């Protein structure tokens, strides 16, 4: 067949990313079922729209029509009933926790309950899509759809099939991404970090490594990147945007001692209320329009040998 009709969207998971994907589709005219199994997760879903509404206002300029936003909110239906979420879905975007057992159970349900014209997309970045594509029962219409953080501003959509994904399904995901304000790109082979994380993770690791071994201050590393390479954002500016919560856990996942100290230092900034752009402060301080106001000085080494000593 083919996948060329995207009027109804089901998103599974209302978390940090889930909510951003829901608002992105809604904001571009699509009706969205916002599914979560636990009613509590949905009771404060309006909190997520408000948080997201600010991001739209700071980052988008003449984009962000507050009415578009309001009517987008009216196109969103929260639900604890998966059969209701799936009933007319032209695409399902699963954004549930990164647990393989959970993915398999969820997708088993989705495969039985959803129409046969429904395109199946998973948002995962910790797992491979082929690890649980079978659980959907329909691998030829199952692929991965990867987003960045603060997706309205950093609006990439990376489409990545398995060896079983039909090309029609790939083209459908690209189409869906185009219709929802995204820059869509085809990741032609199934690999762990798409394009974005494959580029970003070595680069961030090098940046924080330079800092943790006392080779320089975050502003130094970022300025060198910006000027030498003709760019706007160095690693530490990027950390602010990724947010310290993710980045700290990611650093802890390596078990490398210097990455641990990095993660702990991020913790100490989180505890003080500074976890990145979202708080208006991380490695840099920011203004209400998103403006970088300069580096936060207490990261600086002074005459300490490293950040830890």
XYZ file of C-alpha atoms in Angstrom:
309
model
C 0.000 0.000 0.000
C 1.190 3.497 0.947
C 1.007 5.966 3.859
C -0.132 9.386 2.639
C -2.968 10.361 5.010
C -1.997 12.057 8.291
C -5.089 13.568 9.885
C -5.101 11.644 13.144
C -2.082 11.188 15.394
C -1.698 8.951 18.421
C 1.267 9.640 20.703
C 1.987 7.124 23.470
C 3.631 8.836 26.436
C 3.083 12.362 27.721
C 6.566 12.969 29.130
C 9.138 15.638 28.292
C 9.437 14.441 24.689
C 5.945 12.993 24.264
C 4.383 16.339 25.113
C 6.670 18.193 22.689
C 5.793 15.832 19.847
C 2.068 16.097 20.628
C 2.143 19.882 20.565
C 4.201 19.902 17.353
C 1.605 17.836 15.472
C -1.357 19.680 17.019
C 0.251 23.057 16.282
C 0.464 22.097 12.602
C -3.218 21.198 12.316
C -3.372 17.545 13.327
C -5.734 15.992 15.845
C -3.820 14.150 18.541
C -4.739 11.442 21.005
C -2.367 11.883 23.962
C -2.248 8.447 25.563
C -0.860 7.550 28.963
C -1.703 4.442 30.939
C -1.767 6.241 34.317
C -4.456 8.959 34.689
C -2.180 10.948 36.994
C 0.330 11.540 34.168
C -2.522 13.185 32.248
C -3.994 15.194 35.142
C -1.173 17.725 34.948
C -0.667 17.566 31.181
C -1.723 21.206 30.925
C 1.450 21.986 32.889
C 3.424 20.637 29.929
C 1.594 22.836 27.399
C 2.318 25.936 29.478
C 6.003 25.081 29.806
C 6.074 24.392 26.063
C 4.166 27.612 25.277
C 7.021 29.672 26.739
C 9.582 27.828 24.620
C 7.496 28.678 21.563
C 7.367 32.332 22.577
C 11.074 32.693 23.339
C 12.357 30.812 20.281
C 9.932 31.292 17.397
C 9.474 35.043 16.924
C 6.658 35.519 14.422
C 6.009 31.848 14.711
C 4.056 31.313 17.888
C 0.591 32.549 17.116
C -1.060 32.287 20.591
C -4.289 31.262 18.847
C -2.722 28.546 16.769
C -1.416 27.438 20.146
C -4.869 27.589 21.775
C -6.539 25.809 18.865
C -3.670 23.314 18.915
C -4.521 22.628 22.564
C -8.144 22.156 21.541
C -7.076 19.546 18.968
C -5.483 17.425 21.746
C -7.385 14.651 23.550
C -5.724 13.053 26.608
C -6.683 9.421 27.128
C -6.042 6.424 29.353
C -7.817 4.169 26.831
C -5.484 2.766 24.197
C -8.253 1.486 21.922
C -9.659 5.002 21.895
C -6.189 6.422 21.190
C -5.620 4.073 18.247
C -9.105 4.016 16.769
C -8.603 6.306 13.744
C -4.824 6.751 13.987
C -2.962 7.291 10.726
C 0.349 7.273 12.632
C 1.362 6.167 16.136
C 4.442 7.739 17.705
C 5.454 5.717 20.751
C 7.484 7.748 23.280
C 7.263 5.541 26.413
C 10.154 4.751 28.824
C 13.310 3.166 27.452
C 12.524 -0.310 28.795
C 12.594 -3.171 26.305
C 10.008 -5.288 28.108
C 7.702 -2.270 28.268
C 8.205 -1.493 24.568
C 7.332 -5.055 23.574
C 4.131 -5.189 25.626
C 3.012 -1.738 24.434
C 3.685 -2.517 20.795
C 1.992 -5.930 21.054
C -1.173 -4.100 22.120
C -0.754 -1.403 19.458
C -0.346 -4.025 16.742
C -3.572 -5.834 17.604
C -5.689 -2.752 18.310
C -4.651 -0.411 15.505
C -5.894 -0.207 11.883
C -3.832 -1.722 9.079
C -3.268 1.651 7.451
C -1.565 2.927 10.613
C 2.115 3.823 10.303
C 4.099 2.659 13.367
C 6.915 4.908 14.646
C 9.066 4.632 17.758
C 10.986 7.573 19.205
C 13.626 5.464 20.979
C 17.251 6.551 21.285
C 18.463 3.988 23.869
C 17.456 0.845 21.955
C 17.384 -0.388 18.419
C 14.019 -0.386 16.609
C 14.673 -3.945 15.367
C 14.922 -5.054 19.007
C 11.142 -4.645 19.356
C 9.735 -4.136 15.830
C 8.584 -7.769 15.871
C 6.426 -7.124 18.938
C 4.222 -4.893 16.784
C 3.418 -7.838 14.505
C 3.913 -5.560 11.466
C 7.614 -4.849 10.943
C 7.173 -3.705 7.332
C 5.274 -0.675 8.656
C 7.507 -0.144 11.733
C 10.328 2.415 11.842
C 12.089 4.865 14.155
C 11.423 8.612 14.252
C 14.035 10.579 16.195
C 13.749 14.130 17.550
C 16.134 16.605 19.219
C 15.417 18.584 22.388
C 13.074 21.603 22.268
C 11.850 20.315 18.969
C 9.922 23.410 17.834
C 13.271 25.272 17.564
C 15.598 22.348 16.787
C 13.126 20.834 14.369
C 14.924 17.853 12.857
C 13.145 14.595 12.215
C 15.387 11.584 11.569
C 13.521 8.669 9.933
C 15.213 5.270 10.297
C 13.830 1.931 9.186
C 14.845 -1.592 10.098
C 15.892 -4.122 7.491
C 12.180 -4.989 7.304
C 10.751 -1.451 6.922
C 9.108 -0.967 3.545
C 10.105 2.176 1.606
C 6.467 3.333 1.560
C 6.549 3.521 5.357
C 9.834 5.458 5.236
C 8.369 7.906 2.726
C 5.268 8.243 4.886
C 7.273 9.176 7.979
C 9.150 11.780 5.939
C 5.846 13.160 4.690
C 4.424 13.206 8.206
C 7.530 15.069 9.351
C 7.200 17.641 6.569
C 3.546 18.320 7.436
C 4.381 18.992 11.100
C 7.027 21.696 10.648
C 10.057 19.388 10.576
C 13.223 19.190 8.505
C 13.068 15.454 7.644
C 16.107 13.323 6.807
C 16.432 9.637 5.912
C 18.827 7.590 8.049
C 19.381 4.925 5.416
C 20.747 2.197 7.726
C 19.715 1.204 11.245
C 22.448 2.450 13.609
C 22.512 3.378 17.318
C 22.648 7.154 17.286
C 20.954 8.223 14.034
C 22.941 11.138 12.586
C 22.441 13.584 15.421
C 23.643 11.547 18.406
C 26.443 9.906 16.366
C 27.783 13.425 15.741
C 26.837 14.975 19.050
C 28.018 12.370 21.564
C 31.739 12.187 20.566
C 31.781 15.997 20.360
C 30.176 16.558 23.767
C 32.385 13.921 25.344
C 35.484 15.672 23.993
C 34.264 19.033 25.278
C 33.509 17.873 28.802
C 36.694 15.792 28.846
C 38.742 18.935 28.109
C 36.989 20.668 30.995
C 37.237 17.817 33.513
C 40.994 17.449 32.966
C 41.471 21.167 33.614
C 42.546 22.008 30.074
C 40.229 25.012 29.894
C 36.991 26.739 30.902
C 33.661 26.056 29.162
C 33.634 29.501 27.565
C 37.124 28.861 26.181
C 36.113 25.544 24.627
C 32.928 27.015 23.183
C 34.595 30.183 21.860
C 37.269 28.111 20.126
C 34.545 25.997 18.501
C 32.470 29.018 17.458
C 35.315 31.068 15.960
C 37.480 28.327 14.419
C 34.578 26.581 12.787
C 32.184 29.452 12.003
C 29.447 28.224 14.329
C 27.058 29.622 16.946
C 26.987 26.955 19.691
C 29.820 25.077 21.333
C 29.516 21.944 23.466
C 28.630 23.740 26.665
C 26.017 25.937 25.069
C 24.635 22.644 23.762
C 24.647 21.018 27.195
C 22.476 23.915 28.434
C 19.931 23.032 25.746
C 20.029 19.259 26.185
C 19.362 20.023 29.851
C 21.432 18.858 32.770
C 19.030 16.053 33.824
C 19.577 13.940 30.697
C 23.245 14.883 30.328
C 24.053 13.912 33.921
C 22.502 10.460 33.590
C 24.145 9.982 30.176
C 27.512 10.799 31.728
C 26.833 8.384 34.591
C 26.013 5.603 32.120
C 29.679 5.403 31.059
C 31.147 4.445 34.432
C 34.235 6.482 33.515
C 35.493 8.253 36.623
C 35.897 11.675 35.003
C 32.439 11.444 33.467
C 31.098 10.733 36.963
C 32.601 13.904 38.414
C 31.084 15.734 35.460
C 27.657 14.258 36.225
C 27.994 15.136 39.906
C 28.968 18.711 39.067
C 25.853 18.907 36.891
C 23.853 17.592 39.866
C 25.203 20.366 42.049
C 24.044 22.922 39.485
C 20.636 21.243 39.187
C 20.180 21.370 42.970
C 20.889 25.100 42.849
C 18.086 25.593 40.293
C 20.323 25.824 37.188
C 19.821 22.890 34.790
C 20.079 24.699 31.456
C 18.076 27.032 29.242
C 14.808 25.827 30.820
C 15.843 27.497 34.093
C 17.457 30.462 32.336
C 20.873 29.323 33.573
C 23.346 26.472 33.098
C 26.861 26.998 31.818
C 25.563 30.367 30.610
C 22.942 32.762 31.933
C 20.040 33.471 29.600
C 17.473 36.194 29.193
C 13.733 35.841 28.718
C 13.945 36.061 24.915
C 16.469 33.199 24.932
C 19.445 35.555 24.807
C 22.785 34.259 26.084
C 23.981 36.854 28.603
C 27.465 35.417 29.129
C 29.194 32.554 30.918
C 28.451 31.522 34.486
C 31.760 32.190 36.239
C 31.692 29.566 39.004
C 32.435 26.768 36.518
C 35.814 28.419 35.891
C 38.980 26.732 37.100
C 40.707 29.726 38.679
C 43.964 28.168 39.886
C 42.456 24.753 40.670
C 44.141 21.961 38.721
C 40.781 20.469 37.642
C 37.126 21.284 38.377
C 37.250 18.780 41.250
C 40.404 20.192 42.834
